[PDB]
Amino acid sequence: EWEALEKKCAALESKLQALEKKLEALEHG
Amino acid sequence: EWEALEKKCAALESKLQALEKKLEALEHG
Amino acid sequence: EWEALEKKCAALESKLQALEKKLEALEHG
Numbered sequence: 666e667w668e669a670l671e672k673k674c675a676a677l678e679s680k681l682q683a684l685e686k687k688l689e690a691l692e693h694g
Numbered sequence: 695e696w697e698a699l700e701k702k703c704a705a706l707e708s709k710l711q712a713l714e715k716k717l718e719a720l721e722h723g
Numbered sequence: 724e725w726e727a728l729e730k731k732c733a734a735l736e737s738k739l740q741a742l743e744k745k746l747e748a749l750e751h752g
């Protein structure tokens with residue numbers, strides 16, 4: 666159960682970095 | 695404490711989902 | 724361990740708030 670949450674937040678960190686990069690692209694057209 | 699962090703992480707997941715939705719609508723719509 | 728995960732999830736919340744504001748910027752030009 667603790668391990669599951671840790672993996673979850675790590676997945677979220679991954680997804681978030683992906684979104685940040687995608688938004689940087691879209692910002693620039 | 696456990697409940698609080700689990701709820702926070704889950705909210706973050708929902709929010710990330712909502713933002714990627716909005717990003718897709720901006721990019722394509 | 725617990726404190727580091729709380730710190731991480733907090734940093735993720737901050738980053739997601741920044742990204743929401745940025746997406747809203749782009750929705751408006």
Ligand SMILES: [As]
Nearest residue numbers: 674702703732
């Ligand atoms: As988290």
Ligand SMILES: [Zn+2]
Nearest residue numbers: 688689690692
């Ligand atoms: Zn930039």
Ligand SMILES: [Zn+2]
Nearest residue numbers: 689692693694
């Ligand atoms: Zn630029």
Ligand SMILES: [Zn+2]
Nearest residue numbers: 746747750751
């Ligand atoms: Zn808006």
Ligand SMILES: [Zn+2]
Nearest residue numbers: 747748750751
């Ligand atoms: Zn507006």
